UniProtKB/TrEMBL annotation, chains A, C:
<dbReference type="Pfam" id="PF06841">
    <property type="entry name" value="Phage_T4_gp19"/>
</dbReference>
<protein>
    <recommendedName>
        <fullName>Phage tail protein</fullName>
    </recommendedName>
</protein>
<dbReference type="GO" id="GO:0005198">
    <property type="term" value="F:structural molecule activity"/>
</dbReference>
<dbReference type="InterPro" id="IPR011747">
    <property type="entry name" value="CHP02241"/>
</dbReference>
<dbReference type="InterPro" id="IPR010667">
    <property type="entry name" value="Phage_T4_Gp19"/>
</dbReference>
Automatic annotation (TrEMBL), chains B, D:
<dbReference type="Pfam" id="PF04984">
    <property type="entry name" value="Phage_sheath_1"/>
</dbReference>
<feature type="domain" description="Tail sheath protein C-terminal">
    <location>
        <begin position="275"/>
        <end position="371"/>
    </location>
</feature>
<feature type="domain" description="Tail sheath protein subtilisin-like">
    <location>
        <begin position="121"/>
        <end position="274"/>
    </location>
</feature>
<comment type="similarity">
    <text>Belongs to the myoviridae tail sheath protein family.</text>
</comment>
<protein>
    <recommendedName>
        <fullName>Phage tail sheath family protein</fullName>
    </recommendedName>
</protein>
<dbReference type="InterPro" id="IPR020287">
    <property type="entry name" value="Tail_sheath_C"/>
</dbReference>
<dbReference type="InterPro" id="IPR035089">
    <property type="entry name" value="Phage_sheath_subtilisin"/>
</dbReference>
<dbReference type="InterPro" id="IPR035326">
    <property type="entry name" value="Beta_sandwich_Seath"/>
</dbReference>
<dbReference type="Pfam" id="PF17481">
    <property type="entry name" value="Phage_sheath_domII"/>
</dbReference>
Length: 149, 371, 149, 371
């Protein structure tokens, strides 16, 4: 990043996690939303129009981020995470999504996911004879209460 | 044709508390030195003055406005007191500079900003005790006014002598103490009040309380209309009840009146300036324009930045238009549309090709006057 | 623009802003809408049809314009703008969207966005290994109370 | 015309960190040996120098690069604190080279590259204690300026005398110690700050943080922009507010001021060179040129010229233009196209047939001025 001209590229998205999500394919659905509000009023006892107040500022939204593990293997890392929550333990954890530069030693952007994050879904891919380009991917859905840069 | 392109238009000399702020210059006992001019409320004023016990008018004028509207004032100690020459006009409550020590009197002006009104509670009082009569007082009033005129945004409030006939004020104002300018106001009558340190009565000037009249008006409704019907909340009575012939006598000469009404109380009634210029006869207009100037100047930080860039002209038009249209959509302008009520222009013809540092030329129509 | 025949081209859209949105990819969702009204009546006590009055004129609509920054970099300009609003300060600002001619010194069209404009969203792109043509774009959503040519 | 040919012209005797690195001359509580000028961050600085226990100005001016924009800076120790002579104009804040020993002083920095600014925080530390005659001072400031002029790519930070009015600075500037040079600048008012080792206040010269601003400014925009409106972060207050009637006298003679602005805080406003030459009046212009020179000279660094040949001229012309076109593409230069924005020439008319030893003559045009 010697010039203002480059932008971060999909070089090496990776994750800080205590659960061994060691190798991944991709990360998606990541966003930051502040909810707005809208009120319309009539003006102060005179011949002018009403006003629109859109400078009102309600709280911050929460969501979840899709995580795709390349595929099934013999190591049931995500399966146990979901089992602990189904069993009733508040088995949540902090996570860190990292964006990395062309020269990988440079790691400028990180997003902190709240300690209350947890897994609600595990989804299997389709298994069909002869598909060839279908390679048993797994989709993990994690709820993120709060995301901070 | 007041300034708009710059606080300084020949030389690039150019490189909170609230608007209801006034400064008072006068004497006090056991008070902080004149150098540390303070911005205070009443509790603080008393800590810096005492409970009216020095017998000086600052306590009454500060207590006067403070009990009306307003949030703060600048206290000028100037000088001290005798037990139970500080009173002389030059050595303190006058045109003091101190080789820019700006420690005393009117020397604090220019050095100190965020003041819209100034007054001198005690000078119009040393006329007897120290025999400070005639030009000795006129000289101080001329100074207070001159400083306001030099700064460009300040209004001086001054007093007439304490005991006189309506004919006498007319002569005093027309023959011995006329001022003729856009920076000052005077009300004829003196007010009956009191001083709890000694007793239930005391003669005081139409000063201090008046600062609190504009402060309430401007902070609760705005500077759209003059506070010409407001109640002098702390008045006990008036020295003289002005009659119709007296009101007719003062009106055309620019003297404002305070009068008592039968179930309406003691109110300020006149609304004119001490000036012969028709354009600036009313206080409401003079205040309206100073208000707009404070907002426009604080809004522009673009003092030293590519003095040749034209894109700046576009940025200027943008900010100015947004501010004035917002005022149009409220009660500021007398018209049906900004097209017939407000004007702004900033282009190559207003900022000549030479590209002198004296750029930032913006032509504006306030409501009709050109600025 | 020597002839009536040319039209403005996507030469150089750019923006007046105090927040350092120095380099951009694109601007979208820009429109001007006056709301209409529709009333139907029966005619004046005679053998003629009713009428449709569509000359009624309600107030002016407000919206937001999508802004796309080429991509993530180490300079967190937009992130702080959204943080200030989430924190509760009415951190709004005036903006100017400029349309530029083939000969760029000619800058004939500008749109003023009201001083109350503010950022409600920051959205990340997808991060997937090997995508190559996916280059970590960021989407900024700004609410514009009033737009004037 | 600044060199457009070489690091040295008559003899080819010759056969990064960025603009934020600067150097400071003064005394340490403790410190390392004084000769090996070191460059570092606050974190290591304090470990070697001491936690303000010596009562020296370096202890505070160092923050200019740590409580403001910065990275690291070079420190010349001179000597350390007495337990529980250096105040002379000869040692320390002096050209104290030691006869080619690079001893503590302007001379000790001659062998060190990558320094954009030089300050001397302890010159006036003993102004009163050491009886530092205006001469003892003037001689040092002249030595500092000369150092900077000789190195050619760094500038001097000049301190005003400790405590005097506006009149008195107009005086030394015009009558007793003007310096008139494109390599130096001065700010006037002194800044109040605190000292955590013992209490709430100390007075410091308008340096340190003032220089911290240059580092901040360069990160925000191009060096071509002037920090003509920037916050002196870490400042508490100023000794004096300098009014427009004073700005009118000081800016025309090259004295920069810092003011407390009503709603903006303590900011640097003046941005002039302490020079009589109209070409170099603006600080950001002088800096733009030093900026371009450092980068272009490092870039085209070839050693020992082989054969004077057009093929080298072609390589050079192509590289200089490739470098400069970005200043045009970006907002740093003026003009509708590269054609007007900049000029590069290197051919047989800059490098004539005599071809004696070094050739490599490249003529360049910035905006109006030519190198």
């Amino acid at each position: 990043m010697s010039l203002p001209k480059p932008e971060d590229v999909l070089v090496a998205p990776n994750f800080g996690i205590q659960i061994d999500g060691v190798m991944v394919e991709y990360l998606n659905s990541v966003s930051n939303l502040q909810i707005e509000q809208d009120v319309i009023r009539y003006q102060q006892n005179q011949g002018t129009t009403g006003r629109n107040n859109v400078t009102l500022m309600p709280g911050v939204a929460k969501d979840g981020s899709v995580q795709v593990e390349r595929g099934m293997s013999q190591s049931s890392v995500f399966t146990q995470w979901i089992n602990d929550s189904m069993a009733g333990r508040m088995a949540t954890a902090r996570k860190n999504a990292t964006i990395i530069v062309m020269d990988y030693e440079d790691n400028p952007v990180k997003r902190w996911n709240l300690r209350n994050a947890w897994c609600s879904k595990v989804v299997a891919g389709t298994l069909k004879a002869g598909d060839t380009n279908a390679l048993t991917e797994t989709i993990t859905i994690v709820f993120e209460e709060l995301v901070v840069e | 044709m007041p300034s708009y392109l710059s606080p300084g238009v020949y030389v690039e000399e150019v490189a909170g508390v609230g608007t209801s702020v006034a400064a008072f210059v006068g004497l006090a006992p056991t008070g902080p030195l004149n150098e540390p001019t303070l911005v205070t409320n009443w509790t603080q004023y008393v800590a810096a003055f005492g409970d009216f016990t020095g017998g000086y008018y600052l306590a009454h004028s500060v207590y006067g406005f403070f009990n009306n509207g307003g949030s703060a004032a600048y206290v000028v100690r100037v000088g001290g007191s005798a037990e139970d020459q500080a009173e002389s006009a030059h050595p303190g409550p006058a045109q003091y500079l101190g080789d820019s020590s700006d420690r005393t009197g009117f020397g604090g002006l220019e050095a100190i900003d965020e003041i819209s009104m100034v007054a001198v509670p005690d000078l119009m009082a040393a006329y007897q005790r120290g025999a400070i009569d005639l030009e000795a007082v006129k000289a101080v009033q001329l100074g207070l006014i001159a400083h306001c005129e030099l700064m460009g945004d300040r209004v001086a409030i001054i007093d007439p002598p304490p005991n006189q006939n309506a004919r006498q004020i007319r002569v005093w104002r027309q023959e011995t103490a006329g001022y003729d300018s856009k920076y000052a106001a005077l009300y004829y009558p003196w007010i009956k009040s009191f001083d709890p340190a000694t007793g239930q009565s005391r003669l005081v000037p139409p000063s201090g309380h008046v600062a609190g009249i504009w402060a309430r008006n401007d902070s609760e409704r705005g500077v759209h209309k003059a506070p010409a019907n407001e109640v002098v909340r702390g008045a006990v009575d008036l020295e003289l009840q002005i009659t119709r012939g007296e009101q007719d006598l003062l009106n055309p000469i620019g003297v404002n009146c305070i009068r008592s009404f039968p179930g309406r109380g003691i109110r300020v009634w006149g609304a004119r300036t001490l000036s012969s210029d028709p354009a600036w006869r009313y206080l409401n207009i003079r205040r309206y324009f100073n208000y707009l100037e404070e907002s426009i100047l604080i809004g522009t930080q673009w003092v030293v930045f590519e003095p040749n860039d034209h894109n700046l002209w576009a940025r200027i038009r943008r900010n100015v238009s947004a501010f004035l249209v917002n005022e149009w959509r409220n009660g500021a302008l007398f018209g049906q549309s900004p097209d017939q009520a407000y004007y702004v222009k900033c282009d190559e013809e207003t900022n000549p090709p030479e590209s002198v540092d004296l750029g930032r030329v913006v032509c504006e129509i306030g409501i009709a006057p050109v600025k």
